[PDB]
Design a protein around this nucleic acid. Structure first.
Length: 33
RNA sequence: ACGAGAACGCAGCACCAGCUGUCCAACCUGAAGAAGA
């Protein structure tokens, strides 16, 4: 029942350097066998 | 005072011998813990 323009993010803090990173990142790479 | 009387259709003998209730077959198909706590 709450109206919002967009789905706000949920960043974090890493130890200090206040770096905001979205929880759950990864990379994709493909190699034979 | 009978075409009569007397006379066990009876004795011995395994419904038995051989024979896989077996053969093939996936408990399998399709489906985020997100979301304003």
């Amino acid at each position: 029942r709450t109206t919002y323009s967009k789905m706000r993010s949920v960043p974090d803090n890493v130890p200090t350097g206040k770096h905001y990173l979205e929880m759950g990142k990864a990379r994709i790479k493909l190699e034979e066998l």
